[PDB]
Amino acid sequence: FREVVEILDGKTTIIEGRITETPQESPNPPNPTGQCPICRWNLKHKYNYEDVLLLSQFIRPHGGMLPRRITGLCQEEHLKIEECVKMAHRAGLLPNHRPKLPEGFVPKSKPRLNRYLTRWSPRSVKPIYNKGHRWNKVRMPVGSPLLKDNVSYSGRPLLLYH
């Protein structure tokens, strides 16, 4: 973690680099031979949007997704972690990582509607007025198809559309 410090003194602006301590990776990965950070920790096809401890390890202090060249995730796993992180945000988890604006905690709104496993953004969705009958139906998406490869203990495949 590299913090950049800045000062205004005597009409001079001073900018300086500062290096704090990064945690080293945990001692003993289950699949040392493994390539990508998800895989050697044997977490592939396992984590869901619900697992916060795993997701938070890739993101920024102000809440955005971390870049891939730094993390080095197998591309498949990178897109999955994106969708997972967005679902996690919209699900009102990671309340720490929202950016901090003082004027922002003033404006009372009707308390956030609790939602979870939300695929799209709240704005872009248009209310479906027409439904349609048994044979042609408009389906409401739930979760993202990127997660369709997760393990099913029930043996039953997940319902992506309802």
Binding site: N130, G132, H133, W135, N136
Partner: protein, 43 residues
Amino acid sequence: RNRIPGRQWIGKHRRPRPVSAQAKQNMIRRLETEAENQYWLSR
């Protein structure tokens, strides 16, 4: 507000009805029975 022109199952436009996982199960079960059949029908 959605219609199926003419009669439901007859004409050149029909009701779309989809195949289901149940139906696949049944079809495959019956196939397996036939395969075993012709093995015993062979000799």
